[PDB]
Design a protein around this ligand. Sequence first.
Ligand SMILES: Nc1ncnc2c1ncn2[C@@H]1O[C@H](COP(=O)(O)OP(=O)(O)OP(O)(O)=S)[C@@H](O)[C@H]1O
Ligand SMILES: Nc1ncnc2c1ncn2[C@@H]1O[C@H](COP(=O)(O)OP(=O)(O)OP(O)(O)=S)[C@@H](O)[C@H]1O
Ligand SMILES: Nc1ncnc2c1ncn2[C@@H]1O[C@H](COP(=O)(O)OP(=O)(O)OP(O)(O)=S)[C@@H](O)[C@H]1O
Ligand SMILES: Nc1ncnc2c1ncn2[C@@H]1O[C@H](COP(=O)(O)OP(=O)(O)O)[C@@H](O)[C@H]1O
Ligand SMILES: [Mg+2]
Ligand SMILES: [Mg+2]
Ligand SMILES: [Mg+2]
Lengths: 340, 331, 330, 258, 254, 320
Amino acid sequence: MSLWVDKYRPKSLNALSHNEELTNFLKSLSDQPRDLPHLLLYGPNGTGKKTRCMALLESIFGPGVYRLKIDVRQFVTASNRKLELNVVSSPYHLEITPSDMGNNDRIVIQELLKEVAQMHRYKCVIINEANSLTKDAQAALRRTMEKYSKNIRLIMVCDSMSPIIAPIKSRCLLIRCPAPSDSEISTILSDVVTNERIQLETKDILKRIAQASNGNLRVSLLMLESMALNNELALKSSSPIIKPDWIIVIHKLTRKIVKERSVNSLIECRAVLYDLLAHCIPANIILKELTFSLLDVETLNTTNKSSIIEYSSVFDERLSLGNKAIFHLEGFIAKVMCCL
Amino acid sequence: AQQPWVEKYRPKNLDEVTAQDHAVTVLKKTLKSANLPHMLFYGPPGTGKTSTILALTKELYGPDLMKSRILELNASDERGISIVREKVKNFARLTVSKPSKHDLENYPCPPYKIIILDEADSMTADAQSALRRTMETYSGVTRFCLICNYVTRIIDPLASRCSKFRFKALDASNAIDRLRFISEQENVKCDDGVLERILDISAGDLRRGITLLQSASKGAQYLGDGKNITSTQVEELAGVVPHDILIEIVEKVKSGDFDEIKKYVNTFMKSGWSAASVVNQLHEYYITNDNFDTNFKNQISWLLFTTDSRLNNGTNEHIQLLNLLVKISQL
Amino acid sequence: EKRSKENLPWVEKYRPETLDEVYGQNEVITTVRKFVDEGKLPHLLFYGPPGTGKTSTIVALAREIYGKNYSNMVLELNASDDRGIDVVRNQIKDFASTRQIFSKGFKLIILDEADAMTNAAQNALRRVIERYTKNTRFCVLANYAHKLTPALLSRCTRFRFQPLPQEAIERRIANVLVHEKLKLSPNAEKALIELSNGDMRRVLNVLQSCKATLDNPDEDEISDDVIYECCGAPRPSDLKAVLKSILEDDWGTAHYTLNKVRSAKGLALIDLIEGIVKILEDYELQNEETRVHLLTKLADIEYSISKGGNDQIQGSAVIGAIKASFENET
Amino acid sequence: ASMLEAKFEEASLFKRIIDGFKDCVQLVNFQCKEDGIIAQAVDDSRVLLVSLEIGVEAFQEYRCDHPVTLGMDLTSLSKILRCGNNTDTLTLIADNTPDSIILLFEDTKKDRIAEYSLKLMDIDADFLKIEELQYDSTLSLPSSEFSKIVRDLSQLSDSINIMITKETIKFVADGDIGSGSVIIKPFVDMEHPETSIKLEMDQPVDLTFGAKYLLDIIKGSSLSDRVGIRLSSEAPALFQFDLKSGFLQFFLAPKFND
Amino acid sequence: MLEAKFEEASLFKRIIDGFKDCVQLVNFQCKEDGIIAQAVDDSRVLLVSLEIGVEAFQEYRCDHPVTLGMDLTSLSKILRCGNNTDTLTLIADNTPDSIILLFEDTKKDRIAEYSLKLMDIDADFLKIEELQYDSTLSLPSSEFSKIVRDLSQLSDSINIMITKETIKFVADGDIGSGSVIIKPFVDMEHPETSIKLEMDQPVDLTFGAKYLLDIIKGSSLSDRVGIRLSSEAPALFQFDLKSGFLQFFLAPKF
Amino acid sequence: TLSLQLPWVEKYRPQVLSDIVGNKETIDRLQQIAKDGNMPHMIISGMPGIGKTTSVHCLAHELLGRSYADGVLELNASDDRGIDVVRNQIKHFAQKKLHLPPGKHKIVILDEADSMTAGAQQALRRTMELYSNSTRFAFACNQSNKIIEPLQSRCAILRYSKLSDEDVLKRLLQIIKLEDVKYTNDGLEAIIFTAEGDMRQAINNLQSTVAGHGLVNADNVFKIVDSPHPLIVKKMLLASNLEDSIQILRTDLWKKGYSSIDIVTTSFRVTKNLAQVKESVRLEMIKEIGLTHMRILEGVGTYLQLASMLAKIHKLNNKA
DNA sequence: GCAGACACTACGAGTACATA
DNA sequence: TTTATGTACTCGTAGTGTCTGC
Ligand SMILES: Nc1ncnc2c1ncn2[C@@H]1O[C@H](COP(=O)(O)OP(=O)(O)OP(O)(O)=S)[C@@H](O)[C@H]1O
Ligand SMILES: Nc1ncnc2c1ncn2[C@@H]1O[C@H](COP(=O)(O)OP(=O)(O)OP(O)(O)=S)[C@@H](O)[C@H]1O
Ligand SMILES: Nc1ncnc2c1ncn2[C@@H]1O[C@H](COP(=O)(O)OP(=O)(O)OP(O)(O)=S)[C@@H](O)[C@H]1O
Ligand SMILES: Nc1ncnc2c1ncn2[C@@H]1O[C@H](COP(=O)(O)OP(=O)(O)O)[C@@H](O)[C@H]1O
Ligand SMILES: [Mg+2]
Ligand SMILES: [Mg+2]
Ligand SMILES: [Mg+2]
C-alpha cells in the first residue's frame, strides 16, 4: 500500500533485530508449541507488539498466518439494538477487538470464544487493545480461558495494563516490550530511506525524527512519509518538525491557559475541548498530553507544577471512574487556572 | 503432557492442596460424614479455591456422577436475577441422581448435589437476594458453594448462611514444597534461592510462580547450556525492575529538581516497566531502609498507599508515577 | 430433604420449632405470645440483622397457631418466588379473599424478605392489607426498612429483633454440645461470642467446622487454638502485640513484627485491622483530631482493601496511619 | 425388573387425567402403592385442592412393590403425554429410589416404540388426608350442563353464587355489565339417565366461588360425563369426577362474605 | 410469453404454503421444461429447492427463460383468494414487470384477474453439489412430522442416528429425554405407509430444532418424505410432487 | 385456630363527615358539598394516615345512601388499572343509566391514583370531559405530582395537612371513652410524639400497648415501640464533641440492630430536612454522607465507615 | 365427517420509569 | 446518536381449541 509503515513490516522472528533478548525469549517460547501458556504483551504504544505477536504465530503455526480474511458476524443485544462487528479471521488463529460499543462487549467476546473453542492442535486468539475491555468482560473471559486450554490459547495485546483485573494478569504470562531507543529508530528509518528514494544528506534529521516520535515507530514512520511527500523526496537539514493537528491544538490550548486566566477563556476552552472530544481522541490521552504540555512551560513555578500534577492525577482517576469525559477535563482546567 | 504446567500440575485429590490446612482438613473430615454446609470460598487469586472444590467433587462422587450431580455457573454464562430464579431453582428442586452400583462400592456418594457458583461477587444484589431463600429452603437436597475473591460484594445474608473458608495467600513458607515437587518432577535445575525468589515475586499467586518457573525452564531449554537458573533470570522474566534503576530513581528523587525527575520518568515509561512493580519496590526500599526517620516513613507510607489505590482503578501509569515521585521528592 | 436429619448443616439441623426455643428475643416473643393467646394479632413487621431469628420466630408462630399442617395453611412468598404486582393482584388477592380450606381460622400471609419488592407491588399490596384485614393477617420480614413504602410501614406494627446477647448464644451453644456430645472450653466460648457479632448462624458454622477440625470428636475439647485456627481469626494476644509494637517501637521492628504475625498463621490484613480498631476504641484519647485521623485513614484503608491491591503497601499504610495519628500528642 | 410397572389401556386416559388439573396445579406428587396411583396437590394460592386416585382396575397390569413418591412438574408431564397417539399403549416404569420414570409408547399395528424419560422432583409436601365427610347438599348434574353454565356465567362476573333450595338449584353471577340467574330443577330423564340431575338437600347452602378456579374445575368435564357437587357451609365444595376405577375430586374454598 | 394454466390452484397453494417460512424472497427462473427455483435462508444454513415439471400443468408454454423475483406474502394472499374448481392461469408478458394470475372457473358467473409486480432480487448462486449420501430412508411425512414436533418440544437439538435398520431420533433436553426407534416396517395392503432404509454406512447427525420444525410445512406436498444423510454433506429432505419434487438442504450442526 | 378481634383502625373508622377531625375548612367544605349535592371533581392529597380515603368514602356514603352499591365505582392499584380496563370499565360506568336523586351524581373513586399509568390518565381526561353531568371523579393520592397537569386542570385540588397534636389527642380520648382502658397522660403524650401526626400510627401503637400490657403508660409505650430513628440520627448529627456522637451511634443504632444502609439513608434525609444549620454546611455534610453511602452500597458495610462519616462531619463542624 | 370461523390463551417486542 | 438491568404495560402476532354447516 502507498503507506510505508505497513508494507515495511517484518514477517518472522529472524527479521526482528530490534531486541535480542525479547526475540530470544520469543524463540524459546516457539521452540515447543505443545506447552504454550497464555500470553499478555504489555508496554508503551506503537513499539510493534502486534508485529511480535504475528512473528511468533508464524514461528509456531507456520506460514499463511498473514492471510487475513474479513468475516462479518451478527449479534443480538437488549431490545432491538443490533450491533454488527466484523471479525478479522485467519487460518490457524483469530483476531478480535473491542471495536463495538463499550458497555456491551461481554456477549460478543463470550460467544466468539465459545464458538471458536468448539473447533498445531489449538487455535490462537489475539485480542488487540485489551486495556479497553470493561471489567465484567474480563471477568467473563477469565473462566472462558481457564476452562478451555487444549483447544484455545489467548495472546492478549494491551498497553498500560493497569485496567486489566488481577485474575487475568494472574493466569497470563506477562511479556514486557520496551519502547524503541533513538539508535534503533534511526537505524530503521535509515533502512527505510535507503530502500526508498529520498534525497537525504545529513543523519541529523533522522535523529530529530527519533526525538520527536518519543519512541514511537509508527508515528516516526508517518512523520517521515508526511514530510517526505511534503519535501518532494528531498529532506532538508532545517526541515521544520511536523506535528499532528491534535498536538497543535493541545499546545494552543496550553498557551491560552498559561497566558490568560478568565472565565471567557474558560468557555473558549470548553468549546475547544468539545471539538477535540468530537474529533475522537480518548480523554485519558488528552488529559495526559495537556498535563505534560502545562509542565513544560518555563514560566510556571515548581509549586504550580506540583499542584498541576496532583490535580492531574486526581482527575485521571475521575476519568477512569467517569462516563462523560468532558466534565472531568473542564474541572481539571478550572482547577489549573485557579492554581495559576 | 501437551498442557501448561499450571493445568498439568493441578491437584487431583484434597491431599495435593498445599497449605490451606484448615479448609482441606474440614472438607476431608466432612467427606466421611454427610454434613457438608453451604461454603463460601474466598481469598487472593491463585490460592486454590477452584482446585479445592474440583478435588472435593472428584472425591465425593467420582468421574461418573460429576456430570450428573454438579452444576457450575461462571461469568461465562449470564447470572442475572431471571436465570437464578429459574435455572438454579429448577436444579435445586430436582431429586438427586441415581448412583450406580460401582459408585456405591467405591465412592461415598452423599445424598445431595453441589451447586458451584464461581465469581459470585459479580452477581447483582437482586440475584443474591433471590438466591437466599432458595439456598435456605431446598438445602436438604442440594448444597451451594459460592466462590468469590471479594466478600464485600456478597450481601450479608449469604455471608451469614454460607460457611466461610478463607484461603490463605501462598508464600515462600507455605508453598515451597509444591514448587520443589514441580521442579523435581519436571527436571529443572535451579539455585538454592531461586524458588524462594519465585514465591516472593508472586503475592499469594502460586499459579504465577508456576508460570514463571515454566518460562525459566523453557529459556534454559532454548539455551541448551545445561546451567542452573539464577535469580537474575527469573527476576528479568518476572518483570522485576533491576536494583540499579531503582537506585537511580531514588537518587533523582533525593536531589529534587522537578524537571530532571520528569525527564527520567519519561525515559522510565519508555522503558516499559509496570508501575505496580515500581511502587512495590519503592515501598520495599523506603520502608525497610534505616536512613530515614519516623516522619518521612509516616508520610511516604500514605503516599505509596494513595498511589497504589489510584493505580488499582486503571488510570495512566505515567501521571501516577510522576506524581508519586514528585510528592516523595518534596518530603 | 433426603436421608432424614444428621445429614444437614448445623445451621438448619438446629432450627427453632417452638416459640420457647427462640432465645435472645424476650420482649418480642412474650408480646407475640400474649397477642396470640389474647386473640388479637395485628399486622406484624419483623426487622433486624441477619441471624437474629425473624423467620424462625414467624415459622414457629405459624406452627403454634395452626398446627403440624402450617405449610399449606399459610402463603409464604419469598424473593426466590415471583412477587411482581401480578402476584399481588392475583395470588395474595384470592388467598385473602377465600375462606380457609382446612380449618375455620384466619389466613396468615408471610412476606419473607419483603424489602426486595417493587414499589408498585407494595402500593398494590397496601390496599389488600387494608381491605381483608378483618380475617386475614399479613406478616412482613425486612432486613432493611428503607426499601419499604412509608404507607406499608404505617399499616404494620413495628417489631425490632435486637442482636443476640451473650446469654442466648451461650445457651444455644450449650444445647448444641449436649445434643452433639461435644466438649468446649469457657475461653473458647468467649471467643465464639466475640466472633458471633450478633449472628447465631456464624456460631453454628464455626462450631461445625471446629468439630470437623478435631481428629477425635470424642475425648477431646475445643480450646482457643482450634477456634482461631479454623475461623482464621487473629488472637487477642497477637493483636495486642502488633498494636504495642506499632505504638511503641520504631518502624523496622514494628514492620518485622507485623510481617511475622501475618506469616505465622496466614492472618488476613482486614481482620487484623478490625481488631486494631476494636482495641483502639477502648483507648482514651485527649486530642479529638487523633480520632478523626484514625477513623478517616483506616476507613480509606478497608475501602482500598475491599477494592483489592497489594497487601504489603496496605500493611505499611496501616502502620503509618496509626503512628501518624498517635504522633500528635495522643 | 423395574419395581413399578403400570400399563395403560387407551393411553388417552392418562392424558385426560393430566389435562384435568394441568392448568390449576403446577406441582403434584404420586404416592404409588399396591392399591393404586393416588395424588394430592394444592395450588400456589392455597385455594383449590386436587385429590386423585386410580384403582388397579384402570391398569391392564399393575405392580408396585414399595410405596413410591413421584414429585412432578405438570407442564413437562403434560408435554410428554402430548408426545403420542391414543392408539399407543402407555407404561410407567420406575426403578428403586427413582430419579426419573420411563414412559413407553408401544403399538402392535406399527413398531414405532418411543421411550420418554421425565425428571422427578422433591416436592416434600406431606399434606394431610381429607377430614370432611358430612355435607348438607349432595347434587349430581351432567358435566356438559355444568361446564356450560359456568362458562356463560364467568363472563358476567368474577363471583358465582351457588344457592340450594327445596328442589331448586340457583346460580347467581351479578357483575358490572349486568346480572345472571340460572335456575335448574331436578328431573329424571328415563330416555337418557346420564342426562338426569339429582338433588339431596339437608340444610340450605349459600356459597360464592371464584370464576377462574371454577373454570379450572370445569376444564375436567371431558374426563367424566357427570359431576357430583357436594356443598356444605364451613366446608369446601367437592366436585367429584368418577373414573372407571377411581375419581378426580376437587376441593374449592368458598369466598368470604362480609 | 409465459402461460402456465393449472388445473387446480391448490397445488400452487400448498407449494407456497410449504415454503412460506423457510425463505421470503425467491427468483423464479422458469424454463421450457418447467419451473425450478433455489433459495437460501437468512441464516445461510437452510437451502430449499423446488421443481415442478410440465407434466403437472394442464398447459404450459415458456419460450424464453425469465428470472422472476417475486414476493411470497402477496402470492399467499392471492392464492388464499383462490379455491377449488378454479383453474389458475399464470400469465406473463414479454417484459413482465407485473405478473397476471387469472382465476378461471367452470362457470362464467365470476372470473377474476389479478396483478403483482416483480421486485429486484439478485440471482442466487446455483450450487449443483450432489455428493453421495451414506444412508437413505423414506417414511410417511405425518410420522416424521409428529416425531420431530414431539422431540422438539423436549429440546432444541434433535440427534438422528441410523444403525442396524433402526433409526433413533434422540433429543435430550432439560425436562427429560426422548428416544423413538423405527423398525423397517413393510406394508402390503397400504404400500404408501411403510419404512424402508438403505444403510450403506452408519451416520450420527445432529440438527437444530427450528429448521427441522420449519421444513415440516411442506408436508402437504407429499404423503411420503425421503431423507438421505451423509456424514459431511447437508441432509436432503425431499417431497415428492406429481411432476417434480421439492427438496430441503440442511447442513449437519454438531 | 383462634379468632381475631377487629382492629381499632376500622372498628372505629368514621362513617360521618362530622366524625373525622382535621383541617376544619376542608371538612366544612366537604359537609357543604354533602348538603348541596353538586360534587365537583376533586383530587385529595396529603401525608399517609391523615384521613384521605375515609373522608372520600364517608362523603360518597352520605351522597348515595341508597345507591352506593350501584352508582359508586371503587378502583385502586389492586385492580388492573390499565388502558384497556380503564377504558372499558370507566366508559361502561359513565354511560350506565342510573336514576339518582336530582342533586346526586355517580362517583368514581380512584384510591392511590399516583401509581396510575400516563396513558390511563390521558384516557381519563377525555372521559371526564365527555361525562361530567352524570359522573364525577374523585382521586386520593399521597402526592399530586404524579397526576398529569390536565387532570388537575379539570379537577378541584383539595390538599390535606398533617394533624396537630390536639386533634390526635381528641380522637384518642374519644376512642378511650368508647372502649374502657386505663391510661396515663404521659403514655398518651408518648404515643402522640411517636405518631408524629399519623393518626393510624397512633391507633396501632395504642392497640399494641393495650394488648401487650393493658395500661397506657410511658414505659409500656416505649417498650412496645422504640424511639424513631430520624430523631436519634438527628441527635447524632447535631451533637458536637465527636466522641459523644460516636458513642450515641454505637449505643442507639449499632447494638440496637439497625442496618448501616438504614442509618446512612436516615442521615441523608435528616441533613436534607435540617434547618438549624446554614446551607453550606448542610451541602458539605450531604456530600460526605453521600460518599459514605457510595462506600456502603459498593459493599463495604461496617461500623468504621459510619464512624469515619461522623469524623468527617465533625471535622467539617469544627471548621478544620 | 372435514374445513372453515371464531374466540381464546399465550408469546414476542417496544416504550417508559427507576425517591419519596 | 446515552446511559443499562429489571419491571410493568401495551400491542400485534401466531397458534390452539371449539362450534357451524356444507
Ligand atoms: N494450594 C495449592 N496447592 C497446589 N497447587 C495449587 C494450590 N493453589 C493453587 N495451585 C495451583 O494453581 C493452579 C490452579 O489455581 P486455582 O485453583 O484456579 O486458583 P483460584 O483459587 O481458582 O484463583 P482464581 O479462581 O483464578 S481468582 C494450578 O496450577 C495449581 O497447581
Ligand atoms: N433466637 C434464636 N434462638 C435459636 N436459634 C436461633 C435464634 N436466632 C437465630 N437462630 C439460628 O439461626 C438460624 C438461621 O436464622 P433464621 O431465623 O432462619 O434467619 P433470620 O434470623 O431471620 O435471618 P434472615 O434475615 O432471615 S437471613 C436458625 O436456623 C437457628 O438455628
Ligand atoms: N381526621 C380523622 N378523624 C378520625 N380518624 C381519623 C382521621 N384521620 C385518620 N383517621 C383514622 O385513620 C384510619 C384511616 O386512615 P386512611 O384515611 O385510610 O389513611 P389514608 O388517608 O388513606 O392515607 P393512605 O395514603 O391511604 S396510607 C382510621 O383508623 C381512622 O379512624
Ligand atoms: N524489528 C523491526 N524492524 C523494523 N521495523 C519494525 C520492527 N519491529 C516493529 N517495526 C515497525 O513497527 C510497526 C508496527 O507497529 P505496531 O505493531 O502497529 O505497534 P503496536 O503493536 O504497538 O500497535 C511496523 O510499521 C514496523 O515497521
Ligand atoms: Mg476460581
Ligand atoms: Mg428469614
Ligand atoms: Mg388510602
